[PDB]
Amino acid sequence: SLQEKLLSYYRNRAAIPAGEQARAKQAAVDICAELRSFLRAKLPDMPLRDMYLSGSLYDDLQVVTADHIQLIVPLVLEQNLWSCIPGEDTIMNVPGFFLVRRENPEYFPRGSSYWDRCVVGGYLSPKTVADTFEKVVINWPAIGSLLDYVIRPAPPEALTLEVQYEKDKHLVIDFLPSVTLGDTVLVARPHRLAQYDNLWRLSLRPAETARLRALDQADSGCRSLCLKILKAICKSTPALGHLTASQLTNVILHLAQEEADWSPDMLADRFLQALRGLISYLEAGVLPSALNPKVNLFAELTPQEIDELGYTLYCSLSEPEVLLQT
Amino acid sequence: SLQEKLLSYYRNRAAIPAGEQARAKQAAVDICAELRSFLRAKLPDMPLRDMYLSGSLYDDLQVVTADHIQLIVPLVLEQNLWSCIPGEDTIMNVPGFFLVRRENPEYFPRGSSYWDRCVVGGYLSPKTVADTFEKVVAGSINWPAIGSLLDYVIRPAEALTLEVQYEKDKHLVIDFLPSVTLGDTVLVARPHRLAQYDNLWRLSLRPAETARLRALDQADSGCRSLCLKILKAICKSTPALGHLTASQLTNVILHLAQEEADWSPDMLADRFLQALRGLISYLEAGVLPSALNPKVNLFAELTPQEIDELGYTLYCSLSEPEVLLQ
């Protein structure tokens, strides 16, 4: 009956109608295709690659409603002029984040690189880049009419588009600057606290979802289904609002290294293990990344909030119709 | 009628069948998409924007068969470290071509740009840039892996060119074309036919000419592009006329379009006759001015024998143009 409860909860709350999901993503795909050709002509100065889609909607892991997706804005930084410094090596002492430093100004003076205009204190400021990308940025009415969409950028949060693709269907697109030095991929979404605002955030998302997709392909497994049910519960339960998709994804990755068997009838059991696992990580104040275990995925939560989450989850064990209500 | 013969020739010879056209473009788009992923994953620090598709196949100006497209390779050049010098202001006096000069070498020493490695005698060499792309990028691509991945037979052919088999008996030729944008000026690494002018980049005329061709036809539903495509199909089909380029033929039409306002469907046979007559006059004069850049002689790379073959061939058909229409 937990199985049946879980599959009912998925079909009735976690699942997005197949057409809504397809259309929402296609609208994102259309807008991306059009910006690429547009920005091509207009920005001959900027070391940027083409913007590209990212997020659960793109990878079929969005739940409840298809309402949001990112446009990654990938800067180009040359190796001999920049380095990334992991946060645990900075005085910030926070793994999972990075400082981006302008190297060798003696060899290659300031102004050699376009992004020198975005340097603060010798570091590439994630916020100065975001503001720079924003100020430079496009005829949205023109692009809208070309696709028969209604696209309306937001007032400050000006790096988000509101996209009316169907009559009463909208989705949100936000731009996300990004950088790659070596194998390390970074993203301009600020640490929650202002004093960490010069740090870029390590992005784990593409390797995490590829890991999870590859596992499920190899044996027709139910890891992704379990994830989405978990995402849907947290998304629909305001006391669980602080939990993020990346935390839930890594709960499932640890359990996958513990459990080889994820056949459909294992769903109920795997979900219980994930739920008890989340509770345990919450008790330890630490949820390490399965891909990069030095990273504590609870790093931005306060101990109080961490306490509140475990408490909510502990209560839910004896009131199961408050995780599973629709 | 000559009118009937032209209209029928377009449908029977010039127009590419729908299926062949869609498969060729799909193959192009698949490959461009796959290369954007490879550049992201493997060369994220290379000062290039993303490669993108370009040419008549993209602009629906290709004829007879879809056998060719370009992947533009856009260098990122710092606007404060580089300038372009029009060929006619050089000792070489070669309009339609530019030198790309390294600026401020006292303050920003060699190395400050990645592209300094391609500077010869103070100028960014198009050949050295092409050499750099070929071994850093093109030579790092696993073409069999992409082939099995996309399900095409792909074969590198002559230095920067792919052959992609998209049907049993049809292949698409993709050539990589290094390009530079300085301010409003787009330059392309397509060498002047003569070796002594080989440090010169070629001014990119195609996008502006095409945009002008299309805008004119859009305003009155005219037969300019139809006429052009008929002319391209003739030259492509006729060995003695293979020396003409689509840029030359488009400029004949642009010059004709300035003399003639009426290009209704019934006017096709007249305009076509006027375009042949014009071609002859330009070839006799040894000059075909670019419509958008009047200092540039689009016949400047034709040899004497070549111009003599074109002129004689076209004159012979003036008495019976039908002989061109198969």
Curated annotation (Swiss-Prot), chain A:
Drop me one GO molecular function for this one: ADP binding
Q: Name one GO biological process term.
A: positive regulation of mitochondrial fusion
List localization entries: Mitochondrion outer membrane
| Leader peptide range in chain numbering | none
Residues noted as binding ADP in the record, renumbered to the chain:
S54, S56, H68, S203, R205, K231
Q: Which UniProt keywords apply?
A: Membrane, Mitochondrion, Mitochondrion outer membrane, Nucleotide-binding, Phosphoprotein, Transmembrane, Transmembrane helix
Kindly indicate whether the keyword Mitochondrion belongs to this entry.
Answer: yes
GO terms for cellular component? mitochondrial outer membrane; mitochondrion
Give me the Cytoplasmic side stretches, as residue ranges. Answer: 1-326
How does the record say this protein sits in the membrane?
A: Single-pass membrane protein
Region (Important for interaction with DNM1L), start-end ranges: 27-36, 101-110
Query: Tell me, what does this protein do in biology?
Result: Mitochondrial outer membrane protein which regulates mitochondrial fission/fusion dynamics. Promotes the recruitment and association of the fission mediator dynamin-related protein 1 (DNM1L) to the mitochondrial surface independently of the mitochondrial fission FIS1 and MFF proteins. Regulates DNM1L GTPase activity and DNM1L oligomerization. Binds ADP and can also bind GDP, although with lower affinity. Does not bind CDP, UDP, ATP, AMP or GTP. Inhibits DNM1L GTPase activity in the absence of bound ADP.
Q: How does it assemble?
A: Homodimer. Interacts with DNM1L.
Membership in a protein family: Belongs to the MID49/MID51 family.
The name of this protein is Mitochondrial dynamics protein MID51
- Organism of origin: Mus musculus
**Gene that this sequence comes from:** Mief1
